[PDB]
Amino acid sequence: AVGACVLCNSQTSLRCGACIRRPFLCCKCCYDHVISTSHKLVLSVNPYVCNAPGCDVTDVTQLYLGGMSYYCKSHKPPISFPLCANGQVFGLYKVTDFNAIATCDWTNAGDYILANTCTERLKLFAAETLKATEETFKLSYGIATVREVLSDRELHLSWEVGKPRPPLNRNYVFTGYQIGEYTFEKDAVVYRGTTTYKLNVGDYFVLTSHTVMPLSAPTLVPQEHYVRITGLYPTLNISDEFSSNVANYQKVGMQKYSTLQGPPGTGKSHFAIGLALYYPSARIVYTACSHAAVDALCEKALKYLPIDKCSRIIPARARVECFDKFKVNSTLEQYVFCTVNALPETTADIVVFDEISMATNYDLSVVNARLRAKHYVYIGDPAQLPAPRTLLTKGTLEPEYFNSVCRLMKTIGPDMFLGTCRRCPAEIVDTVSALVYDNKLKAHKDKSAQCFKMFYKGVITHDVSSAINRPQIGVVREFLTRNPAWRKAVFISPYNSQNAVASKILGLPTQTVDSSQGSEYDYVIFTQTTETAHSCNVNRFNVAITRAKVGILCIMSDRDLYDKLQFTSLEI
Numbered sequence: 001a002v003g004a005c006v007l008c009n010s011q012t013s014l015r016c017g018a019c020i021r022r023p024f025l026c027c028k029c030c031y032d033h034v035i036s037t038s039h040k041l042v043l044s045v046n047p048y049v050c051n052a053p054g055c056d057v058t059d060v061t062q063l064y065l066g067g068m069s070y071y072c073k074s075h076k077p078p079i080s081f082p083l084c085a086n087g088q089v090f091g092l093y094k095v096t097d098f099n100a101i102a103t104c105d106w107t108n109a110g111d112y113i114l115a116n117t118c119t120e121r122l123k124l125f126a127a128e129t130l131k132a133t134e135e136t137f138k139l140s141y142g143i144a145t146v147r148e149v150l151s152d153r154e155l156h157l158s159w160e161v162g163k164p165r166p167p168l169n170r171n172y173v174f175t176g177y178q179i180g181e182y183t184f185e186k187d188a189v190v191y192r193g194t195t196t197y198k199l200n201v202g203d204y205f206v207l208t209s210h211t212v213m214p215l216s217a218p219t220l221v222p223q224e225h226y227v228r229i230t231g232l233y234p235t236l237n238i239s240d241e242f243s244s245n246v247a248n249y250q251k252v253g254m255q256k257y258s259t260l261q262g263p264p265g266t267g268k269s270h271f272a273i274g275l276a277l278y279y280p281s282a283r284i285v286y287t288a289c290s291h292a293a294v295d296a297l298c299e300k301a302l303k304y305l306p307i308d309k310c311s312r313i314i315p316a317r318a319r320v321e322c323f324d325k326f327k328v329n330s331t332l333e334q335y336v337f338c339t340v341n342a343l344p345e346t347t348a349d350i351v352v353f354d355e356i357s358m359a360t361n362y363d364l365s366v367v368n369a370r371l372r373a374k375h376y377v378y379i380g381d382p383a384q385l386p387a388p389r390t391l392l393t394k395g396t397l398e399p400e401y402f403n404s405v406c407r408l409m410k411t412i413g414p415d416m417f418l419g420t421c422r423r424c425p426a427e428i429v430d431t432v433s434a435l436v437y438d439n440k441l442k443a444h445k446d447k448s449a450q451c452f453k454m455f456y457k458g459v460i461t462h463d464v465s466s467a468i469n470r471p472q473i474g475v476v477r478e479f480l481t482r483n484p485a486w487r488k489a490v491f492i493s494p495y496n497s498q499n500a501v502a503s504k505i506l507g508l509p510t511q512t513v514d515s516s517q518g519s520e521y522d523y524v525i526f527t528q529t530t531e532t533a534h535s536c537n538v539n540r541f542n543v544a545i546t547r548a549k550v551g552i553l554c555i556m557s558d559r560d561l562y563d564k565l566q567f568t569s570l571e572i
């Protein structure tokens with residue numbers, strides 16, 4: 001019961017019993033919280049509650065210190081001091097923002113704005129509170145029981161009455177019953193277990209709610225600038241391949257942390273792996289939120305770094321298949337590749353945290369808590385997609401509010417910027433450069449003359465809330481007959497149900513905009529599907545069209561983004 005105030009660090013015995021996490025609040029801060037919010041339960045060794053038998057007064061504003069015990073107005077002795085008076089709550093060792101974080105429901109974008117504009121201490125209070133709120137919300141959903149098993153990838157489910165049914169996408173990972181994690185995709189539905197199992201009727205699925213651990217480290221350590229490269233030893237013999245990044249590699253060694261904004265195909269993996277070749281004796285931990293982001297760093301490392309000094313850290317509670325070429329779970333190898341949630345407690349000369357738009361402040365803090373490093377490098381792009389905020393339903397979350405790193409990149413600018421896109425045909429580069437890069441992204445490739453746009457609203461149908469546009473798929477089908485080279489295209493849309501329909505009608509491999517991030521394909525066929533805030537999001541639009549190396553066909557619903565596409569328009 002003795003700790004430090006979450007706002008001003010002043011030692012105290014008081015914790016807010018009404019807050020979901022129970023933060024310690026000093027006398028002068030606890031008061032300003034109880035007096036401005038519905039939160040009135042104050043806890044010390046024992047709660048501030050009326051000691052009189054059978055009395056239910058818990059509100060600290062209605063309580064007094066009667067000698068050594070606590071009583072309300074109705075039970076206090078003659079000589080009794082109010083627990084609440086003179087700007088303080090009585091405690092040992094004798095905030096408008098803390099109040100909003102403590103009481104919000106995390107459904108508004110303004111909640112996330114505050115969680116990123118508040119003091120560092122409140123960014124951790126905000127991140128822990130949010131995550132606990134998200135986990136308790138999983139309990140709201142109804143249990144899914146197997147009614148019948150059709151095939152090895154198809155079943156029919158029975159849902160709990162009186163409780164809502166969770167969305168059926170890859171975002172929502174169930175737990176079978178303890179037959180391993182399972183996912184669903186759309187009366188026939190597609191089942192997919194992280195463990196292969198002969199689906200038994202009666203077996204049920206629940207979204208696994210995980211215990212939210214406390215946060216201790218800041219999202220960003222305090223910045224330090226150095227006059228020389230510190231604790232790192234550069235090479236003179238540096239491969240011409242990486243010569244373009246030498247000045248930025250030196251910048252990395254002359255600051256405690258650095259931010260790198262890398263638009264699509266500008267050389268983020270190449271930069272990250274080249275940092276290892278520039279400081280050859282440095283121990284580097286390569287981290288990211290997703291297994292796909294960590295695997296892409298492994299792939300680039302396989303090509304340039306000694307395979308014997310690499311290790312892929314895999315949590316024994318294996319969910320999806322990941323990179324199999326390095327020695328597994330060797331925490332002490334010079335190069336360690338690991339997701340944030342699986343990071344061991346270790347030190348490093350450099351920590352490289354990739355795909356930073358996908359990180360939350362909870363992730364930023366966990367990295368600073370598990371890894372003690374001489375230098376930290378944050379790689380990503382605030383113009384790409386952030387992590388899904390399952391509770392957020394009102395308002396759009398801007399890039400400067402994704403996390404502390406993205407906030408810094410959008411306000412003071414990134415420390416380093418990769419300005420040349422080597423992946424995309426110039427039509428795509430020119431469009432996204434104007435759309436989200438303030439005209440600073442330059443094209444390496446020429447215009448491919450294989451980038452097309454078609455304005456076709458079609459017809460929007462819905463599978464629950466996930467959207468389908470069958471006429472936009474029909475327009476694609478007609479295009480494919482006339483453009484057989486496009487047979488090899490990856491179909492992309494902002495909706496899984498649209499992708500399910502295009503998979504059966506077109507036979508192309510399918511990908512949501514969100515799951516395509518980090519990947520590249522020679523040809524992309526994109527159907528916007530709808531003109532909603534989701535399908536019109538500039539970050540999602542940016543990711544969707546920058547997946548293409550050679551050609552792209554965009555069937556658009558929104559006149560605005562259609563007009564912005566610097567593509568050859570098609571007719572039908």
Ligand SMILES: CS(=O)(=O)NCCc1ccc(F)cc1
Binds near residue numbers: 021129
């Ligand atoms: C119990 S909590 O309020 O939910 N989380 C505390 C986060 C924190 C930890 C250390 C600090 F120096 C500042 C804040």
Ligand SMILES: [Zn+2]
Binds near residue numbers: 019033039
């Ligand atoms: Zn409270």
Ligand SMILES: [Zn+2]
Binds near residue numbers: 005006010
């Ligand atoms: Zn305080």
Ligand SMILES: [Zn+2]
Binds near residue numbers: 050052055056071
């Ligand atoms: Zn009483």
